[PDB]
């Protein structure tokens, strides 16, 4: 049944995986409005598609910067994976294309902003609020992992809240399809599993560890391992010690001890019963997984929405022109994009 669903899902995913959509729009088809976020090798902007008037979020990557940061293959992974997946809590890729200078991915615009912004402002979420979001991640990971995908960058900065108050997972820049083990040091310091820090060779269990960090941060207001410098964060992560706020329920602590488990033969998500050890944990006893998947559960809050194109749920960023060189850069490197 779940197995039945995942089978058809894999069948759909593979058709697209083997025959990726490519070159499905052009820069001039979009009016650029405002930067929604920005950092290494690119930015994401709110745009309007001229022929339809729809708004989208367009990620713009500078090919030369991608090459210097050694992110060529990770970028190809991101686009090939995003064009192939389909799940209610995964942001959709509607168009992609490239020009002499940049790569572009045009995604649904999610006007409610990042969970990060809301969580930092409110301080922490109640357990029922955190459980509502955590449930959607659990199902999204059940989906991605069944397609042999590892996501590798779970954090509130990468989770958007939509107009119904549900989560859309974005930022697939480190996602990878791999059977068996992989070794790349990537992720965000507060969310790395011990085996990534220790250069061990790792698999989807790192996403389940990251879910434990995320649930902790949502419910506490701060992550379980924090310091002023990454090295001190890593020393805390590998120590085997974790402390919980005194307001955490006993069921919540027990789930987190099993997720934030350094020993892989004991980490929930990674045992004989797979994701079911998580879905059937007492902390989730009230969660109706089907109702969540169907978006039938009432959300903890609906973001304020002041009209189409409104960005007030996003921070302001310095704006920079989109320059397109008269010469093609890095054509060979990104030919399959």
């Amino acid at each position: 049944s779940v197995k039945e669903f995942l089978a058809k899902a894999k069948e759909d995913f593979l058709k697209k995986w083997e025959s990726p959509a490519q070159n499905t729009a052009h820069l001039d088809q979009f009016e650029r409005i405002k930067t929604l976020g920005t950092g290494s090798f690119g930015r994401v902007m709110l745009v309007k598609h001229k022929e339809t008037g729809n708004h989208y979020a367009m990620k713009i990557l500078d090919k030369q910067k991608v090459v210097k940061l050694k992110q060529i293959e990770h970028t190809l992974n991101e686009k090939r994976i995003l064009q192939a997946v389909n799940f209610p809590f995964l942001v959709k890729l509607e168009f992609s294309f490239k020009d002499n200078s940049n790569l572009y991915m045009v995604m649904e615009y999610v006007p409610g902003g990042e969970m990060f912004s809301h969580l930092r402002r409110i301080g922490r979420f109640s357990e029922p609020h955190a459980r509502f979001y955590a449930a959607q991640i659990v199902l999204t990971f059940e989906y991605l992992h069944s397609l042999d995908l590892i996501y590798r960058d779970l954090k509130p900065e990468n989770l958007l809240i939509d107009q119904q108050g549900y989560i859309q997972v974005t930022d697939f820049g480190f996602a990878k399809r791999v059977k068996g083990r992989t070794w790349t040091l990537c992720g965000t310091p507060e969310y790395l599993a011990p085996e990534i820090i220790l250069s061990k060779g790792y698999n989807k269990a790192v996403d389940w560890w990251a879910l434990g960090v995320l649930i902790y941060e949502m419910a506490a207001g701060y992550p379980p391992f924090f310091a002023d410098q990454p090295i001190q964060i890593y020393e805390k992560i590998v120590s085997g010690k974790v402390r919980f706020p005194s307001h955490f329920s006993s069921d919540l602590k027990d789930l987190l001890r099993n997720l934030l488990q350094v020993d892989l033969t004991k980490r929930f998500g990674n045992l004989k019963n797979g994701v079911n050890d998580i879905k059937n944990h007492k902390w989730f006893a009230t969660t109706d997984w089907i109702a969540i998947y169907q978006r039938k559960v009432e959300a903890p809050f609906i973001p304020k929405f002041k009209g189409p194109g409104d960005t007030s749920n996003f921070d302001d960023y310095e704006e920079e022109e989109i320059r397109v060189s008269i010469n093609e850069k890095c054509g060979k490197e990104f030919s399959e994009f």
């Binding site: 050694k70 900065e157 820049g173 480190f174 040091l185 506490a220 992550p223 924090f226």
Partner: peptide, 20 residues
Amino acid sequence: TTYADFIASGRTGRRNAIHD
């Protein structure tokens, strides 16, 4: 309090990914 220690730390803004 742990919360006060977090709020006074330099890592309450958006966190960058790492890579080699």
